[PDB]
Amino acid sequence: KDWQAWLGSVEHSRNTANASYQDLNLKRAAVLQEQSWGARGNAAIADFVT
Amino acid sequence: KDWQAWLGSVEHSRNTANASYQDLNLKRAAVLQEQSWGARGNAAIADFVT
Numbered sequence: 001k002d003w004q005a006w007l008g009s010v011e012h013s014r015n016t017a018n019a020s021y022q023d024l025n026l027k028r029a030a031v032l033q034e035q036s037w038g039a040r041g042n043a044a045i046a047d048f049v050t
Numbered sequence: 051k052d053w054q055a056w057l058g059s060v061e062h063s064r065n066t067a068n069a070s071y072q073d074l075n076l077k078r079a080a081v082l083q084e085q086s087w088g089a090r091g092n093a094a095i096a097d098f099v100t
Contacts, residue, residue, distance in 0.1 A: 016100060020100060
């Protein structure tokens with residue numbers, strides 16, 4: 001029983017990190033996309049003024 | 051008589067230390083077990099929050 005419980009905990013200890021790894025990148029990609037879109041919009045105004 | 055008494059004292063001088071050596075380790079093991087169990091409980095809350 002004790003080693004079975006130990007293995008059960010070990011399984012979730014991996015599942016949780018495997019789950020979190022995807023969501024972190026999901027947030028980062030959106031942040032970078034927003035920043036890149038702002039940077040793309042700055043140059044349009046620069047060229048319009050020039 | 052005097053050397054017999056000397057030997058009698060020498061015997062207990064060893065018995066006392068032999069007795070104390072076990073109890074010191076007995077205390078230390080329990081202390082370490084409690085600390086390890088607390089450390090094991092911290093990670094569960096960490097994972098729950100994550």
